[PDB]
Amino acid sequence: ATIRADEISKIIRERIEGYNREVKVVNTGTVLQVGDGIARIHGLDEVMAGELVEFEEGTIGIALNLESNNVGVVLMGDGLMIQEGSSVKATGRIAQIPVSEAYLGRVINALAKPIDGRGEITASESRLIESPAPGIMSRRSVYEPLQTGLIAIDAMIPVGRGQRELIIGDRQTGKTAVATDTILNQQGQNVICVYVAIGQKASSVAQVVTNFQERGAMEYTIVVAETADSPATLQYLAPYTGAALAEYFMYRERHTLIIYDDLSKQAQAYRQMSLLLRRPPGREAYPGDVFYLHSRLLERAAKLSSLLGEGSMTALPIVETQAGDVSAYIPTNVISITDGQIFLSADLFNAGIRPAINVGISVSRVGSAAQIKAMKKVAGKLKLELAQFAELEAFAQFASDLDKATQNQLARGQRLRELLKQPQSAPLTVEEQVMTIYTGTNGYLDSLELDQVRKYLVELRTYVKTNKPEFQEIISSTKTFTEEAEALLKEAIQEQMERFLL
Amino acid sequence: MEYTIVVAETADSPATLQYLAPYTGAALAEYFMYRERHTLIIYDDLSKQAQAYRQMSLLLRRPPGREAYPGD
Amino acid sequence: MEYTIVVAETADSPATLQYLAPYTGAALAEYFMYRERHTLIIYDDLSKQAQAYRQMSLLLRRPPGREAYPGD
Amino acid sequence: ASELAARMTAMSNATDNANELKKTLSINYNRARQAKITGEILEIVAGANAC
Amino acid sequence: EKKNLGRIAQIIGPVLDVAFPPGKMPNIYNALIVKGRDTAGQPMNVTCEVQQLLGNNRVRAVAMSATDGLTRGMEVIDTGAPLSVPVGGATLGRIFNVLGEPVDNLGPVDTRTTSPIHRSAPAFTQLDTKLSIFETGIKVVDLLAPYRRGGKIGLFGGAGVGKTVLIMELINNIAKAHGGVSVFGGVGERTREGNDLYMEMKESGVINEQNIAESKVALVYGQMNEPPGARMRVGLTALTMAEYFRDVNEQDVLLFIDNIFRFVQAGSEVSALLGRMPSAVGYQPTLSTEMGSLQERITSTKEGSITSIQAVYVPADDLTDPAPATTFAHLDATTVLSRGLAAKGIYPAVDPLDSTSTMLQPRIVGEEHYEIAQRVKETLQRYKELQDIIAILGLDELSEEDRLTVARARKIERFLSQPFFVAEVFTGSPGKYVGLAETIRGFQLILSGELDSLPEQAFYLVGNIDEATAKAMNLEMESKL
Amino acid sequence: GLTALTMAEYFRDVNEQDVLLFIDNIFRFVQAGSEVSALLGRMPSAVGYQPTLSTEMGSLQERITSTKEGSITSIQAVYVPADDLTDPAPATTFAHLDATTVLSRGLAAKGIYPAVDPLDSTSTMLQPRIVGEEHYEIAQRVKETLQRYKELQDIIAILGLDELSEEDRLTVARARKIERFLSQPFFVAEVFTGSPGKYVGLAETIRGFQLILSGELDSLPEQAFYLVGNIDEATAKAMNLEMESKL
Amino acid sequence: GLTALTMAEYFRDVNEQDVLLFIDNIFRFVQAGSEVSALLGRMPSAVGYQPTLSTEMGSLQERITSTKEGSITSIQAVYVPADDLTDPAPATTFAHLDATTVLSRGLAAKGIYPAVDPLDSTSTMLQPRIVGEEHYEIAQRVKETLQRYKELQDIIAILGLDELSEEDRLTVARARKIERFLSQPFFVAEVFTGSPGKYVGLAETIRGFQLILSGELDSLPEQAFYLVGNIDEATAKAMNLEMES
Ligand SMILES: Nc1ncnc2c1ncn2[C@@H]1O[C@H](COP(=O)(O)OP(=O)(O)OP(=O)(O)O)[C@@H](O)[C@H]1O
User: Fold this and answer.
1) Are the Cβ atoms of D30 and E320 closer than 8 angstroms?
2) Do B67 and D40 touch (CB under 8 A)?
3) How far apart are CA F81 and CA F88, in angstroms?
């Protein structure tokens, strides 16, 4: 470079006082050209590639790309108050983050710094940002079910502990209350959630964190939250600290559930962080590195084998198809890096199905291996009925027919589709959604008033467990849908149909 | 044609004049306006004016935005 | 086969050989064109020649143009 | 009247399907326009420096 | 702050790279005025802010006024802080440019108190929890597409549709019903429309030409004459001028930031000027970050709400491209003003069907409000459908189970039209403020089936529903004569 | 191109004679400028051409003017890059070119040669006081009929030829007759057509179009107006085709 | 890619075996090249890739050649980015491959797995000498039916299916039967959903396609051929569909 960053007059004065003289500068460097969030520091020859260099004000920086003279760092906090000529010092640690079992409940600001304002957290650091992703021998296939809570998701597109599963919707249609529902249903079973909001308006993450507060998920969840008013480097590293913080609990034999929010926004902040560097972009001006970015991030969320202890981390990232096209660069990229998609269609949510899940497109590659041994057969029957309804509504059977549906199958498919809709943030237990699935698929109730199947089944769920606690026991202990359970739930729903008749 | 200043910029006229012509007519009509007379300045091919500005800027090595049209 | 030269360059040739394959063919056919035999050169993937020329010219850091193809 | 109602329902499903096709074509046209413009801009900026 | 004299080394168009002595340097966004000399012979000083540092003590700064006439070597003076905006009760009525000097020539503004433009975000503990409905005073907005206090609002409709009378109604109703004041924040406002709006204000009692500091608007006009660094920072100027109101008087503030696409356009202009490599379709790379820094300080802090109302102009009419995408990622209520409805005369022209809000959900509004709003939207859907068929069949031939639907649909479409406290200068109607409860009960009575006998033109341009019954009873009195 | 311009400018400045320069592919005068401007150090413009595309193109085109010593009539065969009719290289030359003539691949794929577009090809010599009143009226009626056909191309292609009116069907058949009648056997395009060429004057084509679009001869088959010199030759080809049909 | 390819070529050149290398996501190799050459200072190229995007992947592909000692049948799951085939990173792989089968997302959005698009899927082995005139002729006939269907899809657009005459109606019924039949429950897709896998042979599927194109199977509905194996099993599925009504 003709204009090299190591050509400030003061800087070359430091080298010109002694050419081949007394031993060089070890750890003290004056920041120069502290511009687009990327401070070029002179000196610091002891910096490990990836060091955690501190500044004068107190703004931490990663030393990613360090050239022959200038150790160009990526300062995390906004490089506003940093003036040229300030002295910096490396810390001697490689992208390390303080993490402990005391973060459960806090609201971290993507640098292991609390932003709730109630106290500071202590830890043993012990975790890295650029961690070695779990190897090939260490991952054991996903079998442990993860009770997302939503009927549609955990019935046809199941998620298992350790199987990443993105939530690819559109703008302003689900995925946030939907991911919050999946976190919220995790109250009884032990998980250490990490709801890491990459780009969200501060009011939205305030609403979500207060929802967690009043509904009790704060006993385990960890909102590593980064507002939309944050330098793109912090929105870039927010899911990395989220993932390292969840991995501190994944490696210690404890199931976790991390949820990135707007993983498209991390790619957008990386697009900013790179086009400020003027590194050459690719499709849609993404710097091409977004696949490696979402590989390091999403690939460190999988179930570990019994060698390293039975740990697990579903990743549930949330890409937003702002373009309205799933075949855009970052949505298809995260679909290629993830193990399955849960598409939240915009048109169905505008239509009224409140979990906007469409069943045809949204697939889960882990499949029925994830579901409980109870739900496999009944959800297979429900998926059969949903295929039937999908064809009957998408294609012919508009004129009455040779087939003549709405008498045999269209009514039942409509009952299923109007049954899949949930309330707002009202999670359903495993046995309850088992019975909700069973009622519609095997024809226990078909001729009801189709508008109010939910309005019936709220009374059904209220009555059945208080009438027959045997069902909750057979589903909670055996985890298998035995036929004696079918008989007793038949009796319970008979009595419920009676009390609904009167 | 008694009352019409046709500021004319031919093609082989350099880039700066095809850039400056709207401003020249504007400086004439602004005088005629500030002296109480209603005027009517009719430019021709502002796309061609911006093309001449594109010329002179990209020659002057100013960073280009969309459609390679310059910053401002 | 007794009358057909095949100037063949594989994919794993360095991009100069792919760029010079059609020129070698054109010169070897033009020898017969000056020897008054009505030859017939057939290129194959002439897109690959310009692609390898693009690879060279971008590896030479000469400025590119449309579709990142170099100037000439 | 039956033929006219059949022509009416043909034109009706044709109008609904043409509306769906216009929406899909507008989406594809916007993604094509953005791809074309961003490719143009990357061409221009990358040819600007030419180190 | 200091006599940080530097030389304006490079002046490329609007961008002027200034050098500084190696001791003291203004950090990013730290405003600096240059002691310039105009061609006329007066020492006019064009103000700048450091958009970028270039290392060798040369901070690349963009200018808030024309750089025509800035020799290199001119004394540039650092202020040590971002652009000081003369906030306070004083800046209530006058017009402002970006640097904070009144251009309406009325007089000087009290700079006793001033806040910097680039104050950072509020905090997580300072944000408020409850998703609180913002009672505007328009029956359409309050029923169908409520506005979030502390949220964002999009007025998709262009000019000529009645946007100016709508925003004037909103400001006057904020000053009347609520306790707060509004701040029109016109960013890149075409000066003809700027003076149009200012005169509409001064003739509509929104700001008093005889009484300033009693008025209800803090006009911030960044005219498109000004360089790209100016009409970009006009949004943030209006934002801090409203944030002082919020965090000093604890009152509900309204930001009428004019069409955000001009702010994003100015960001693209200034980034292409700084040479930072452009992003997707051609807006700046720091598009999400910049527009989020503009629209994240719109948050209901525990002190008071600062809810904004931001026009949005989609280029080539697509929600797909990044600027409308990154904007609609932030908006919390989108209400379009419809040109055909405006030409009809159903003022306000806000379209009842295509307008939507994320607040409309029942847990936010109220179960009865969600039910009546969804039923009104379904009724207006039915009428938009049957507008095709009432031409062919007529109002009588079609079935009389949905003839009631069409009748109540005409009644709703008329009842949504509300006379304004601003339209008094044009037509002479007094103007009625309609609370949320009143319009809820009115729409419940209209759609439930009681008022199936009142005439259709009795609901047109009326306030509360009992006033509509009064209009109908007066028409009944005059029916005999 | 500048060499041709220098010869023509000499013959217009000194020899006092009106000269007719044909430049073929004036788009090369811009593309070669692109290939040199890339290396020269000048920054790239839009889609890939030189920055001074417009000033260079003007430096060629402006020197072609009737200058009181003669008249340099000129016919530049501008090349539209892949029929990008919005590209900079034709977009800058449309401003300089008086009687532009946009030839279309769309009206060549169906074999109507020359492939000149009836609509897009427009000239500022189609003003009535300059070109003749009846000629102007016939040109307006032909262009309007072709515009109506281009607007009915969507209805015809999808909903069938029958689903439109029976006066508009007459306008469609008349537009077909016109857009086939404005085909020409060139003398130099006989090797492509196989048929001899017919040079037809202006008044003869006006008298042909008058009878074609006046509805007086809407009975002839469409192929009887294809690749035909004059309307009388079209009438003769109708007889030839009606005899060949039964024979 | 290079190290797995060396591991395979050592077996093909020293031990003389017919080894296979199922190189997965060739595009990830090219995109890794894109990253390294965006950081290696090498000047940028078409849309984002390295300038040597046709010589580096040439060093990948051209080392996979069947030598006179042993042969290697690599199956490279090259990935088109953003689902467009005009992209250079798969466009430079199209020229190297010889039996390219484009898994277009259309047939998977319709639920037809595998979504191998029959028009785009093409091979240099669809020749008379290789497969015999029988299988070649049936391949030509099925590609004919599917191409006619795809070209009148522009009419199965805005208008309805009815507007076709009897010719287009019959060819659409046959094309729907075919594009449904081209689905198959995999032996490894027992996990996701469906039947245990069915291994379908060449001389067996040729019978099914001869039967469908011969017109002797107009009686069967569309959801009978979907996700079935051989044609006898397709008729069995239709019969059981009629019994279950
Ligand atoms: N199942 C549901 N039923 C009813 N309303 C819902 C449901 N889920 C979400 N909402 C509504 O959606 C709003 C939250 O937005 P949503 O989660 O739909 O999209 P989002 O992810 O916030 O959008 P973005 O991706 O832009 O952040 C809430 O105000 C809530 O009222």
Assistant:
1) yes
2) yes
3) 9
